């Protein structure tokens, strides 16, 4: 095809796109298929010839819908948000027009120095200490990253390259064979997947820090297992803190993690995947306190705020580290800060996102969902029936029927098997729990309220 | 912004998109922007409220363009080219409506399930054997990796797991670190940078093996480096045959490098980044014979099969080799195939730009940009000043004026400041070359000729 049949078909996906998002409260959020069930709906082989454009949309409604689960209805309420906004469309429909392959300065300038400002933009609103800001003269500096699973091994291959020359300059016969075998990473027992994902591709050992009443890694138990493992003969080089973890949303202590970071010359990357974007509201920001000791901070602005994926943000005090894994002030050189060495226009979306909502409308965006969260909470507050697993400060609350997990586990087979709701459990010290979180950008009071009506009714008949 | 909003905003985005695309030949390729040129030209902080769309646009014009390079320009000759086409901008549209992250198959059957039968249609474009191809009972399969750079880094990480099992078995006290001290790892002195930053990341010796006349790895320069490693006690685990080298686009001669990777159960990954998509045609298939005795090959449609960056294909022929490294018939979880653990409903640009294109328009495509290269390889070849560098087999020709490296270093200097088009140079053994690369998808013979004419006219002038 060609650019006036895109100047029509492109109109018409824009209104495919639109109707889609704006009647998805009639779709079902889960879907029903059986896996396998696409192959045998479409041919083996492609066509020799086109097909027509009207035909392949009427594939996507006949065939590809009833495998979707839609992630931006107002009644999916598992995981975390995943973001969807129309200026970050519009930024990504421009940003595949331009087309270019950042791979360098010289791949396309600005495609590299929007980023950079992107990220102090972005550094400012959540009022980061200015050791991460590129600004003029800075040492340090953010990126976007693929994603945070993405940015946690980057910093960790940063951390272990580091620590290996640290260990080398002393010892120089020493390989780098023979320094894996006594590294030693850490995370909290409530850490993301991804961190042992990165320590098994980083090639060290990764041990979880027990967390506390509240789910939070502490100084304690953080120095109990460094004086356990230094007396073994392992060297720890990386802390992963978490902000937000998937469970229960806690947060480790960075305040007393961060000074022990220090101290031991450990490389303390802060994780902040999902609560990360609160951050940007003073409320919030208290939470945030003691990044001033990580080395790298991360968060996805591509779980809430907005900014549709393939967007996580991530924050170095030293590109120099960071850079030495993979070899001031302005950035010129982008592939020595991530895996891939190409790269798209992505900053195009934050900027579209950042103007076309402004700071005030991405904070009222934060608030709006912590306080559909609440509104959740307050209802299972009232029933005696239920009980909240955890303290609820963002958008996700822990919640489960007093009782016994096969109960509990029972009531999620009746919500799922119901259809009209998505929300997926959890365990909280092998206890049983259901997560409800606000995901969606258009959840209103009612959505929530509708949705604990459904789920108090079918508590009700269960208990029964 | 809502709905209503987005149908006019993305309709005028639409144009502007046709628009540029339209009219890029108007635009200057390369910029003359200096490094740090747009920190100034914008606000050092976000907006509070909301910037108008129209505002927006103005400075995409303005402010972005200036410091852009147009990789789709017909007069951009760079690099190797980058995919750009309408069907795959209709995909890319769609796929952030749907707004899913695929991390598992529930979180969106379809956008797994379309994917795996996306990659066994493109499998069966390129005629590759069997064991590649899902199909209902197959034990291999592919996977849309982000880039070749990150499919090369996953291959070497399951030919590391692979190798440190076997070792292992033999030798259970045996470390990871211990293994890593003696693996090495092997690619043509023509390979891509990113094999180095795979063993680079991965950990492991990289060492690169000496390539013949026609600048391609052959069996004999193999085995040589094997036998001296091997008696040095060092074990050989993994080796990267390139078909479509980047300097002068040469081919490593699978044929023979197979049967001595499968001997000495070495892991073979084929890349074949740029070439790869000129396999779909019969009369260039030849080139990938031997890929049968590939573990793992890759080629990326988002450089010369129209579908828009973000979208590498790779395929093994065991999942379980590749699976091993992140822990038949249908996959579920592309989790364990990548290096992240999100991911987006890339499969879409794939399905979209192979059914409108059909496999003939995707064909004519591929050999209408042989054909110019051939017509460019004819004019070099026609004026005794110059002189061809190397066989021409796909878009890409590497001449020079016949004389000293500083001459041609001069004729590259003023090409770039003449500023008409854009080329990069390279060298073949140790020689200065220029390269001239077919890439945008709407060259056409007048182009070529004209740039042609253009730098015989400043050979002329230098010359004198
Ligand atoms: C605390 C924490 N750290 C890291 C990650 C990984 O982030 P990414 O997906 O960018 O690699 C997570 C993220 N996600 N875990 C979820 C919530 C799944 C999910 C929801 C929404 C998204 O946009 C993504 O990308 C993933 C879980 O269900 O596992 C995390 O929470
Ligand atoms: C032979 C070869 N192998 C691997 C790679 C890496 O691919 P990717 O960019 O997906 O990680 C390359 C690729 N690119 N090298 C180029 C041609 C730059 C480039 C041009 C067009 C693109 O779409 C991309 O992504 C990159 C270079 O000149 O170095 C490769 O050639």
Redesign the interface.
């Known amino acids: 095809?060609?650019?006036?049949?895109?100047?029509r078909?492109?109109?018409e996906?824009?209104?495919?796109?639109?109707d889609?998002?704006?009647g998805i409260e009639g779709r079902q959020v889960?879907?029903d298929?059986q896996?396998?069930?696409?192959?045998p709906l479409?041919?083996?082989?492609?066509?020799?010839?086109?097909?027509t454009?009207e035909?392949?949309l009427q594939d996507?409604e006949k065939?590809?819908?009833?495998?979707?689960?839609?992630?931006?209805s107002p009644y999916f309420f598992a995981?975390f948000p995943?973001?969807?906004?129309?200026?970050?469309?519009?930024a990504?429909?421009?940003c595949?027009?331009?087309?270019?392959?950042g791979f360098s300065?010289?791949?396309?300038?600005?495609?590299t120095?929007?980023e950079?400002?992107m990220m102090?933009?972005?550094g400012?609103?959540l009022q980061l200490p200015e050791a991460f800001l590129a600004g003029?003269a800075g040492e340090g500096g953010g990126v976007i990253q693929?994603?945070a699973?993405?940015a946690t091994?980057v910093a960790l291959?940063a951390a272990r390259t580091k620590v290996v020359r640290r260990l080398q300059a002393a010892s120089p016969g020493l390989?780098?064979?023979?320094?894996?075998?006594?590294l030693v990473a850490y995370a909290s027992d409530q850490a993301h997947?991804?961190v042992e994902?990165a320590g098994?591709?980083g090639?060290v050992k990764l041990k979880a820090i027990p967390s506390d009443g509240k789910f939070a890694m502490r100084a304690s138990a953080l120095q109990e297992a460094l004086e356990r493992d230094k007396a073994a003969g392992l060297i720890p080089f990386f802390v992963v803190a978490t902000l937000g973890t998937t469970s229960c949303c806690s947060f480790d202590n960075l305040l007393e993690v961060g000074p022990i970071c220090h101290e031991e010359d450990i490389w303390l990357h802060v994780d902040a995947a999902y609560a990360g974007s609160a951050f940007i509201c003073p409320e919030f920001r208290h939470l945030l306190n003691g990044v001033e000791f990580a080395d790298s901070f991360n968060f996805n602005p591509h779980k809430w705020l907005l900014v549709?994926?393939?967007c996580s943000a991530m924050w170095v005090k030293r590109r120099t580290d960071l850079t030495g894994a993979?070899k001031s002030?302005?950035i010129?050189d982008y592939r020595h800060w991530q895996?891939?060495?190409?790269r798209?226009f992505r900053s195009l979306k934050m900027?579209?996102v950042?103007?076309?909502?402004?700071?005030?409308?991405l904070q009222a965006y934060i608030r709006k969902h912590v306080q559909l969260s609440h509104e959740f909470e307050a209802f299972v507050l009232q029933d005696p029936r239920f009980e909240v697993c955890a303290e609820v400060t963002l958008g996700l609350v822990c919640f489960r029927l007093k009782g016994s997990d096969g109960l509990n586990e029972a009531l999620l087979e009746r919500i799922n098997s119901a259809r009209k709701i998505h929300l997926v459990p959890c365990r909280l010290r092998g206890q049983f729990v259901l997560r409800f979180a606000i995901c969606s950008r258009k959840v209103e009071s009612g959505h929530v309220r509708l949705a604990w009506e459904h789920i108090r009714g079918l508590a009700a008949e269960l208990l029964a």
Request: hydrophobic share 45%; with cysteine.
């Open positions: 095809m060609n650019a006036s049949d895109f100047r078909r492109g109109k996906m824009v209104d495919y796109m639109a889609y998002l704006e889960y879907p298929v896996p396998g069930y696409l192959r479409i041919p083996a082989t492609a066509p020799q010839e086109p097909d454009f035909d392949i996507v065939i590809i819908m009833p495998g979707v689960t839609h992630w931006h995981y995943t973001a969807s906004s129309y200026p970050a469309m519009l990504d429909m421009l595949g027009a331009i087309g270019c392959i300065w010289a791949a396309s300038p600005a495609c120095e929007l950079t400002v102090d933009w972005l400012k609103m003029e693929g994603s699973s993405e091994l291959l390989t780098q064979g023979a320094v894996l075998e006594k997947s991804s994902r098994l591709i090639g549709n994926f393939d993979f002030g302005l010129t895996l891939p060495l190409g798209r900027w579209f950042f103007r076309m909502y402004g700071v005030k409308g």
